[PDB]
């Protein structure tokens, strides 16, 4: 065997070095004795570190590929937008163990799956809604520190902007995973990303990070920006 090392990176996120040269990350589970999506676990005493698979989570992919700005902290209140079976939301809940995660889902069947996977993670608050109509859930979602978006639609950028106006604190952050082909099927992805970056900046964001999650997802880029205002 080789020396093993688990060290904290960012805030409440862990780098796992098994000594084989492969980059690995994990989160400290808030619901011990449970596997959300059959992920690998490193149990040290009572703590359980859940291996965060980049092939199953775009956020993990972004971190593995070099994300330097990770605004989600332990006490962060985050607005999660996008279809999910519980993978990324479970890890975000582990990180923000002293915070809250509002999960917006349109389809009852998706919310059903999310509810089964994030069962005992009580800091995750499910909200059946349409991200394109943020005013409908404005009496539930309090001002947030971070908005994480993963919706493969042509209007994904305006959706982030619309939700930022409604819920994002000034100085807060917007994290958005953009699938180029979900916006345009003809243009060059490089040009599509450039135009999307401009739309976000024109919308009120100052782009502070950009990560090509290339191996794990083709023609997908994670954008991170600070919300300045209107």
From Swiss-Prot:
Tell me which PROSITE patterns the record gives: FIBRILLARIN
* Keywords on record: Methyltransferase, RNA-binding, rRNA processing, Transferase, tRNA processing
- Binding-site residues, S-adenosyl-L-methionine: 87-88, 105-106, 130-131, 150-153
User: What superkingdom heads the lineage?
Assistant: Archaea
Name the SUPFAM superfamilies for this protein: S-adenosyl-L-methionine-dependent methyltransferases
For the keyword Transferase, the answer is: yes
GO MF annotation: an example? RNA binding
Q: One Pfam annotation, family name?
A: Fibrillarin
What the entry lists under InterPro entries is as follows: Fibrillarin, Fibrillarin_CS, SAM-dependent_MTases_sf
Q: What is its EC number?
A: 2.1.1.-
* Record GO biological process: box C/D sno(s)RNA 3'-end processing; rRNA methylation; tRNA processing
Relate the protein's function as given in its record: Involved in pre-rRNA and tRNA processing. Utilizes the methyl donor S-adenosyl-L-methionine to catalyze the site-specific 2'-hydroxyl methylation of ribose moieties in rRNA and tRNA. Site specificity is provided by a guide RNA that base pairs with the substrate. Methylation occurs at a characteristic distance from the sequence involved in base pairing with the guide RNA.
User: What is the similarity comment for this entry?
Assistant: Belongs to the methyltransferase superfamily. Fibrillarin family.
Subunit relationships = Interacts with nop5. Component of box C/D small ribonucleoprotein (sRNP) particles that contain rpl7ae, FlpA and nop5, plus a guide RNA.
Protein's name according to its UniProt entry:
Fibrillarin-like rRNA/tRNA 2'-O-methyltransferase
Species: Methanocaldococcus jannaschii (strain ATCC 43067 / DSM 2661 / JAL-1 / JCM 10045 / NBRC 100440)
Q: Cite the source lineage.
A: Archaea, Methanobacteriati, Methanobacteriota, Methanomada group, Methanococci
Q: Which gene encodes it?
A: flpA
